[PDB]
Amino acid sequence: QVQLVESGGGLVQAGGSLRLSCAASGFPVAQEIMTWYRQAPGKEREWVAAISSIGDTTAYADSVKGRFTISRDNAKNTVYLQMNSLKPEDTAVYYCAVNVGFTYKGQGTQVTVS
Amino acid sequence: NLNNEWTLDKLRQRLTKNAQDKLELHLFMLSGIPDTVFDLVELEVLKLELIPDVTIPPSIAQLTGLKELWLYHTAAKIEAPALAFLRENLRALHIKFTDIKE
Numbered sequence: 001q002v003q004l005v006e007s008g009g010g011l012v013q014a015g016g017s018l019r020l021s022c023a024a025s026g027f028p029v030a031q032e033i034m035t036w037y038r039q040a041p042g043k044e045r046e047w048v049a050a051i052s053s054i055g056d057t058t059a060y061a062d063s064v065k066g067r068f069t070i071s072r073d074n075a076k077n078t079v080y081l082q083m084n085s086l087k088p089e090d091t092a093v094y095y096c097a098v099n100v101g102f103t104y105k106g107q108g109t110q111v112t113v114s
Numbered sequence: 115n116l117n118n119e120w121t122l123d124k125l126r127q128r129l130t131k132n133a134q135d136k137l138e139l140h141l142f143m144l145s146g147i148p149d150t151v152f153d154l155v156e157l158e159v160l161k162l163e164l165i166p167d168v169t170i171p172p173s174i175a176q177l178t179g180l181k182e183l184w185l186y187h188t189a190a191k192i193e194a195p196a197l198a199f200l201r202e203n204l205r206a207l208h209i210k211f212t213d214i215k216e
Contacts, residue, residue: 033163033164033187050143050164052142052143052163052186053163053186053210054140057140057142058142058143059142059143099187099212100212101212
């Protein structure tokens, strides 16, 4: 019954900042691996960033090295996808996935970047 | 190239002191185990998370002080000498999985 809803979209050019929320529900289990996937129209799955089950160690793709960041807070069972200094080519609808039986992909919120 | 990437000094800087008072070396989100991690025989607890198509090298026998192995969502193959060394030296095993094959 765990559902992953996403928000935080908008319109902004390069040098912006947004935090996509990977909010989970059902019960507090926000201590697992959250694999982010990005889907620009006309392509297929591409991994963005994953967080260890410990939660203290993680890494992102080399294309977003030093800019992309992820964080989480178990108080309300959500994961924030921190963004800063985004390239104009990152305008896509993202997805966050946690592997508990299924690789659950959320609803997906589009982010518009000029 | 991953074995070439991680030098001994970088791994020793990656060392952690866990709550159980033992030398911890944590590797997360890697294609495989770098063979340089087996050069530091002072390792005590080894944590590996999301390591695909990983085969345990025979070089694991160098880790005399290895006691704890953590396998998080990782299915691993093992060599016969490595299997013997783990059968005769391993103390703790942390298995986190989501499927039988893991």
